[PDB]
Amino acid sequence: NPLELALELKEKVEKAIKEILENPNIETRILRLKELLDEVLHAIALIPQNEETRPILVRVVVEVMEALLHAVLDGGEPLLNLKVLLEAFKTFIAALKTIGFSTEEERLEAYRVLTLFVHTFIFISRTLNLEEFLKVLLELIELLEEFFLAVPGPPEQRRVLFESLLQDILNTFKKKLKLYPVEAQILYLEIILEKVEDVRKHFFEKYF
Amino acid sequence: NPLELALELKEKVEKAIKEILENPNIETRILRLKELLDEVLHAIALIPQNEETRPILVRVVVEVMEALLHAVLDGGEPLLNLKVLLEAFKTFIAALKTIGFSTEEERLEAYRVLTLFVHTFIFISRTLNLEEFLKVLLELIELLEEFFLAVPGPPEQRRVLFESLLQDILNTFKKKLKLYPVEAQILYLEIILEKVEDVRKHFFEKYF
Amino acid sequence: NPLELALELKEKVEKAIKEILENPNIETRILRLKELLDEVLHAIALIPQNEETRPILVRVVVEVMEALLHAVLDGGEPLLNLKVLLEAFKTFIAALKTIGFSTEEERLEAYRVLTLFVHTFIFISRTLNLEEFLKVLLELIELLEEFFLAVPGPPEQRRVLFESLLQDILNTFKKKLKLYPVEAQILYLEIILEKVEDVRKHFFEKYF
Amino acid sequence: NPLELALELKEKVEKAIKEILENPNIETRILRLKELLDEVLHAIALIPQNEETRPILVRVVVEVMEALLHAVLDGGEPLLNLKVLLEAFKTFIAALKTIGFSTEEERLEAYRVLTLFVHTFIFISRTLNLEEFLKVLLELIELLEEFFLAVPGPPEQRRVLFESLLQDILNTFKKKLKLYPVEAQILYLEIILEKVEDVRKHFFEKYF
Numbered sequence: 006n007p008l009e010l011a012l013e014l015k016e017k018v019e020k021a022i023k024e025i026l027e028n029p030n031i032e033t034r035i036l037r038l039k040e041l042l043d044e045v046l047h048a049i050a051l052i053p054q055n056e057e058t059r060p061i062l063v064r065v066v067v068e069v070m071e072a073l074l075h076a077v078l079d080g081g082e083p084l085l086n087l088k089v090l091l092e093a094f095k096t097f098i099a100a101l102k103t104i105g106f107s108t109e110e111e112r113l114e115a116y117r118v119l120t121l122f123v124h125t126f127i128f129i130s131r132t133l134n135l136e137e138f139l140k141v142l143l144e145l146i147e148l149l150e151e152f153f154l155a156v157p158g159p160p161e162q163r164r165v166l167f168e169s170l171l172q173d174i175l176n177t178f179k180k181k182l183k184l185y186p187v188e189a190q191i192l193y194l195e196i197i198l199e200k201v202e203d204v205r206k207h208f209f210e211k212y213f
Numbered sequence: 214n215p216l217e218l219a220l221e222l223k224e225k226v227e228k229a230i231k232e233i234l235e236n237p238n239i240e241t242r243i244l245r246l247k248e249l250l251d252e253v254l255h256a257i258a259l260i261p262q263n264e265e266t267r268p269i270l271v272r273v274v275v276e277v278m279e280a281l282l283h284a285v286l287d288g289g290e291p292l293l294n295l296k297v298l299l300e301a302f303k304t305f306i307a308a309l310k311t312i313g314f315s316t317e318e319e320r321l322e323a324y325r326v327l328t329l330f331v332h333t334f335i336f337i338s339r340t341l342n343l344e345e346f347l348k349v350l351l352e353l354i355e356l357l358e359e360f361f362l363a364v365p366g367p368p369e370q371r372r373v374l375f376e377s378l379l380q381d382i383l384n385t386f387k388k389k390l391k392l393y394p395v396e397a398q399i400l401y402l403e404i405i406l407e408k409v410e411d412v413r414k415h416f417f418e419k420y421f
Numbered sequence: 422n423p424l425e426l427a428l429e430l431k432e433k434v435e436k437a438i439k440e441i442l443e444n445p446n447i448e449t450r451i452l453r454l455k456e457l458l459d460e461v462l463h464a465i466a467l468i469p470q471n472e473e474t475r476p477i478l479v480r481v482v483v484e485v486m487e488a489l490l491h492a493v494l495d496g497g498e499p500l501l502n503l504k505v506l507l508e509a510f511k512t513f514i515a516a517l518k519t520i521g522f523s524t525e526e527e528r529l530e531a532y533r534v535l536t537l538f539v540h541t542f543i544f545i546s547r548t549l550n551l552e553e554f555l556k557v558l559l560e561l562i563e564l565l566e567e568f569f570l571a572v573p574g575p576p577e578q579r580r581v582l583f584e585s586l587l588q589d590i591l592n593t594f595k596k597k598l599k600l601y602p603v604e605a606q607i608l609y610l611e612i613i614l615e616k617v618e619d620v621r622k623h624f625f626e627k628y629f
Numbered sequence: 630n631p632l633e634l635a636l637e638l639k640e641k642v643e644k645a646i647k648e649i650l651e652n653p654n655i656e657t658r659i660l661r662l663k664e665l666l667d668e669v670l671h672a673i674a675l676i677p678q679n680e681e682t683r684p685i686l687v688r689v690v691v692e693v694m695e696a697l698l699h700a701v702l703d704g705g706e707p708l709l710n711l712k713v714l715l716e717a718f719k720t721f722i723a724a725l726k727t728i729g730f731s732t733e734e735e736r737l738e739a740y741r742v743l744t745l746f747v748h749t750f751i752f753i754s755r756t757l758n759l760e761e762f763l764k765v766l767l768e769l770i771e772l773l774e775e776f777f778l779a780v781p782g783p784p785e786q787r788r789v790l791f792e793s794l795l796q797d798i799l800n801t802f803k804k805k806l807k808l809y810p811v812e813a814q815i816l817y818l819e820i821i822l823e824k825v826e827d828v829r830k831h832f833f834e835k836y837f
């Protein structure tokens with residue numbers, strides 16, 4: 006019966022998270038959390054999927070991702086943390102795709118997780134230099150587009166959240182750029198604005 | 214149901230403001246209030262929006278902005294406070310645009326908040342020197358134009374309030390300018406008068 | 422047929438300007454207008470060139486440049502706006518060179534655009550410090566020389582307009598310099614006077 | 630009959646483009662587009678060449694290259710996309726040489742595609758470091774020379790477009806160099822100016 010499998014997977018994930026959080030090494034915590042996320046994805050892949058189990062899997066994946074975000078916020082080199090965050094976010098999108106969403110509560114949970122991820126990524130990536138900043142920001146924008154193409158729902162919130170998150174990214178980029186001479190402003194502002202306009206156009210063509 | 218979500222968001226914001234206010238550090242209070250404003254915006258973004266929730270969201274945003282203005286008025290460096298005020302007020306326009314306005318009470322509350330913001334900004338920016346003074350006054354005028362383009366309503370009040378606020382800004386600018394030799398008067402008076410004339414022309418073309 | 426191509430280019434530019442002006446972000450407006458100028462230059466390059474098309478190309482370029490000047494006058498950091506104005510003016514000179522100039526009406530339109538550019542540049546550059554002021558003023562004088570060498574016509578107007586514009590620049594420079602102690606007067610006044618005398622001598626040798 | 634072969638090749642290419650654009654992975658999209666371009670070249674190689682088929686082949690090659698440019702603009706490591714762009718542009722030149730050019734419309738289409746390629750390449754290569762920037766710019770200039778030697782036509786447009794593109798490259802190079810200390814300016818400005826002067830001299834000797 007699928008429901009019992011969902012409960013046993015939930016308990017297994019809870020014990021695994023409790024074990025991993027106990028470890029003193031922060032980098033070890035991050036790596037084991039990423040591996041746990043991948044194993045959770047493979048576990049959902051095997052479990053039968055239906056109405057009742059779907060919210061259970063959604064919640065368990067949300068707990069894993071939130072725990073990983075909190076752990077990656079504690080310590081570590083910023084670049085390694087950002088790369089692990091990107092890989093984990095790709096796995097998160099894949100898990101959300103295979104699970105599928107029906108109820109509104111799961112949609113709101115995923116949207117909250119996305120907002121938390123965006124804020125955490127911006128906060129961590131604040132400390133880098135210019136080139137890595139631009140690279141990670143472009144990767145974040147692309148993954149944002151992929152996630153908004155992954156979760157189906159009403160288009161109004163789909164538009165509002167995308168606009169708000171792109172505005173957050175632009176504000177952070179401008180804030181960072183104001184620390185550099187006038188010449189770099191032109192180049193990097195042009196690059197970021199063109200990328201944002203392109204992704205906005207792609208999304209607006211999609212939802213129509 | 215949207216209403217219960219509105220109430221619960223209100224309560225969360227109330228204890229959030231209460232907690233943050235007990236913090237001893239001033240700069241921490243300002244920064245966390247700005248974070249709370251942004252998170253509130255993202256919260257309304259997800260909250261289903263209809264007739265009854267609209268006033269509740271307007272009230273909670275008004276309380277957050279008023280608390281931030283009072284906290285900013287207490288202590289801190291002038292320029293940093295002004296920049297945080299500008300960012301938070303831009304977020305305020307974004308939140309008001311997302312919410313939408315129907316009733317007159319919400320409109321009057323928004324106009325009162327705008328008046329409070331303008332007076333506080335002028336009072337704080339009084340202490341700076343002419344270059345930063347002129348800069349902050351210019352983006353203050355631009356953000357005034359954006360806000361008055363954001364909230365729809367009757368045009369007579371939208372004209373009278375704009376004229377009064379521009380008069381306040383001009384009086385403050387003249388008061389500050391009267392401390393320096395005659396040469397600066399010409400240049401800076403010309404700059405400010407041209408800017409205010411241009412924004413007035415833009416608004417008067419808009420509402421017609 | 423060249424005439425139909427000129428008309429379709431005109432129409433494309435009009436909707437391009439209409440779309441661009443709609444955007445809320447000021448910096449995006451400025452950058453996209455600069456790209457529109459460059460693409461207009463490239464389009465004119467391919468367009469077959471003859472009598473009737475010349476006025477049409479002169480108009481469309483004039484409208485694009487005027488819209489960019491008005492947009493730049495609205496908002497933005499002074500230095501970035503000035504630099505974008507410089508590159509746009511270089512593109513404008515190149516476009517005027519490739520188009521060719523026969524009729525008097527197009528000449529008067531080009532001279533009016535040059536006067537507008539000079540006044541706007543002076544007004545915007547008023548707010549900078551001495552070093553940036555000197556740099557931007559010297560670049561402005563050099564591009565003025567290039568433009569007056571780009572558009573052929575009767576030499577009396579080419580002399581009178583050059584003298585008037587140089588006088589405007591000198592008056593603005595003196596007005597700005599009167600804010601600072603006596604020592605800076607000697608240095609920067611000497612630099613600007615020598616530059617102006619040199620460019621005047623070059624032009625007067627040229628037209629003879 | 631050659632005409633039916635041209636239509637069937639057109640339909641095959643449209644179906645292939647539609648299939649490739651569907652793929653989620655961006656790098657796969659780029660690679661399959663490049664392979665499609667090469668296979669298209671081999672297809673025209675076998676296709677009998679005459680008057681009516683020539684415009685059809687020009688159009689289909691233009692669509693393939695435009696789709697590849699748009700896909701390359703979406704995502705990927707900049708250096709990889711630049712190298713793929715260089716290889717695809719070489720293939721594009723070879724295809725244009727094999728097809729031949731008689732009508733003016735095909736010439737204008739090819740020139741527009743060249744302009745799009747130059748702008749996209751400059752925009753993408755903006756983000757690299759100094760040495761890679763210089764290398765890719767030199768390869769771009771060389772391929773520009775080859776393309777302008779590939780498509781025959783009137784020499785006036787051949788001159789104007791070359792001058793405009795070289796000016797674009799020089800402006801971008803100066804803009805990037807303005808981010809670095811004074812010593813690097815000398816060396817790299819010298820290298821780029823000598824290269825562009827040499828290629829201009831070669832072209833001017835050619836067309837005479």
Ligand SMILES: [Zn+2]
Nearest residue numbers: 043044046047
């Ligand atoms: Zn795996």
Ligand SMILES: [Zn+2]
Nearest residue numbers: 075076078079
């Ligand atoms: Zn922590």
Ligand SMILES: [Zn+2]
Nearest residue numbers: 173251252255
């Ligand atoms: Zn936010």
Ligand SMILES: [Zn+2]
Nearest residue numbers: 283284286287
């Ligand atoms: Zn107080």
Ligand SMILES: [Zn+2]
Nearest residue numbers: 332377378381
């Ligand atoms: Zn007042």
Ligand SMILES: [Zn+2]
Nearest residue numbers: 459460463797
């Ligand atoms: Zn160009």
Ligand SMILES: [Zn+2]
Nearest residue numbers: 411491494495
């Ligand atoms: Zn204006």
Ligand SMILES: [Zn+2]
Nearest residue numbers: 667668670671
């Ligand atoms: Zn092959």
Ligand SMILES: [Zn+2]
Nearest residue numbers: 203699702703
């Ligand atoms: Zn795209």
